[PDB]
UniProtKB/Swiss-Prot annotation:
Residues 1-11 have a biased composition (Basic and acidic residues). Acetylated at C-terminal lysine residues, thereby increasing affinity to histones. The gene is NPM1. This is Nucleophosmin. The chain holds residues 225 to 294 of 294 of the full protein. There is a cross-link at residues 24, 26, 33, 39, 43, 49 (Glycyl lysine isopeptide (Lys-Gly) (interchain with G-Cter in SUMO2)). It comes from Homo sapiens (Human). The modification Phosphoserine is found at residues 3, 18-19, 30, 36. The lineage of its organism: Eukaryota, Metazoa, Chordata, Craniata, Vertebrata. Involved in diverse cellular processes such as ribosome biogenesis, centrosome duplication, protein chaperoning, histone assembly, cell proliferation, and regulation of tumor suppressors p53/TP53 and ARF. Binds ribosome presumably to drive ribosome nuclear export. Associated with nucleolar ribonucleoprotein structures and bind single-stranded nucleic acids. Acts as a chaperonin for the core histones H3, H2B and H4. Stimulates APEX1 endonuclease activity on apurinic/apyrimidinic (AP) double-stranded DNA but inhibits APEX1 endonuclease activity on AP single-stranded RNA. The modification Phosphothreonine is found at residues 10, 13, 55.
């Protein structure tokens, strides 16, 4: 394995999986491209159900704790 490290194009890295890892990738897109992400639970839940096919309340609170762990 070998290096050349002269250009390797520009960074951008688009991401969107089948499950809560899409929510995590789209949280990065909001806090980078939009600069901001919601900081209070009921507005953040509105945003999560706007950004994904979210239905599992146990995964919603697991994700809210993961978003507060930032």
């Amino acid at each position: 394995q070998e290096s050349f490290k002269k250009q390797e194009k520009t960074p951008k890295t688009p991401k969107g999986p089948s499950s809560v890892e899409d929510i995590k990738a789209k949280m990065q897109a909001s806090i980078e491209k939009g600069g901001s992400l919601p900081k209070v639970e009921a507005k953040f839940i509105n945003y999560v159900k706007n950004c994904f096919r979210m239905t599992d309340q146990e995964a919603i609170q697991d994700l809210w704790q993961w978003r507060k762990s930032l």
